[PDB]
Amino acid sequence: MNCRSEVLEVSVEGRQVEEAMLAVLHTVLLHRSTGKFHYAAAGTYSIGTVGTQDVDCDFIDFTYVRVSSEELDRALRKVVGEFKDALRNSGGDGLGQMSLEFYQKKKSRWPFSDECIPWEVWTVKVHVVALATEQERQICREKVGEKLCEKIINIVEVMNRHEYLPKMPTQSEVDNVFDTGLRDVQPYLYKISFQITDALGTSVTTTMRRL
């Protein structure tokens, strides 16, 4: 179960950092979750029902679908808020990224604590652009939505080409595969971190050959 990674990239105004991030995360998390399991003593379990809803963006001409859990939404909005604060207060660089990683917990013999193994990680890099006019604003609200369309498309397409998923737990193994802390949804064990990066340059070789 070696880890699989995907890299998305988006160019937005600061105002739309949150919604953009919220659009990507939620899209991934809609595919990487299921109904809550209720186990019986016999070992079987029933699966609950996941709701979905539409989110119209206020700073992007865009709508995305998310699971109807409000705990999950408040969590992701919070970590994305951490990302926006760090990004704003980083200043000139303006090269930020967030990673959403899915992992299993594997039990180790004492004294070693259980090892978290990633099976899939999503990184999205944010390029923030400064706008001067109200017109640039209005066009940006459209073009960013058009770009997030192809982002969601590629997330779905990749979601089909990934053939690996952890195998359904038993009542005791559940918390090594699923996050069971929410009321309305049962996400795969995930982890959202972020990182502010310094921009680097580009090599010249084959570009010479092209010239």
Binding site: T27, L30, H31, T34, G35, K36, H38, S46, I47, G48, T49, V50, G51, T52, Q53, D54, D56, D61, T63, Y64, V65, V67, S68, S69, G145, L148, C149, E150, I152, I153, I155, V156, E157, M159, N160, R183, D184, V185
Partner: protein
């Protein structure tokens, strides 16, 4: 048949009906919102809360006429725009196909895959040009289900295809995609 076959034919039937419902439901011009439930009902197919609208259920059962997608036999939902002048133009042809290749290695895994495919369908239906169009309704959006024999030339030259996804089953693999202007 073997129990897997009745369960599977049922799964593909309700996947098809729910597919029609999600596609038509993403073009009414208003937002869709359903609630999660840890104490579910016997009618929450694929562990998704998708409320059927009886009329669309009726048109889908009449288009299917009581049969399943198969080789050379695919279910299509066509979304068009009609203006005040009467110009008709198809915008989307959503296609639910059944490929030949069977998956022998693969009961509820196919059920789970079809649930995931419906979640992908939910996501993709909103990132198509016809979504932003259908939300702002002048003009009126139209839907129509049929069981072909799929052909797209009504979408003119140069249409692109988004593959919502595929699900292998022991009778064949299901492909859900959309051809749009």
């Amino acid at each position: 048949n073997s129990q897997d076959r009745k369960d599977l034919d049922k799964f593909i039937k309700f996947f098809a009906l729910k597919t029609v419902q999600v596609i038509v439901q993403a073009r009414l011009g208003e937002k869709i919102c359903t609630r999660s439930s840890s104490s579910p009902t016997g009618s929450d197919w694929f562990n998704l809360a998708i409320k059927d609208i009886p009329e669309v259920t009726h048109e889908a059962k009449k288009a299917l006429a009581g049969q399943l997608p198969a080789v050379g036999r695919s279910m299509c939902v066509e979304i068009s725009l009609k203006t005040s002048e009467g110009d008709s133009m198809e915008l989307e042809i959503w296609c639910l196909e059944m490929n030949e290749k069977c998956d022998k290695e693969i009961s509820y895994t196919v059920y789970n895959r079809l649930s995931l495919l419906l979640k992908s369908l939910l996501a993709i239906t909103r990132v198509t040009p016809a979504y932003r169009l259908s939300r702002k309704q002048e003009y009126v959006i139209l839907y129509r289900i049929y069981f072909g024999e799929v052909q797209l030339s009504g979408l003119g030259e140069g249409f692109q295809t988004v593959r919502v996804g595929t699900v292998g089953t022991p009778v064949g693999t299901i492909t859900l995609s959309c051809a749009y202007r």
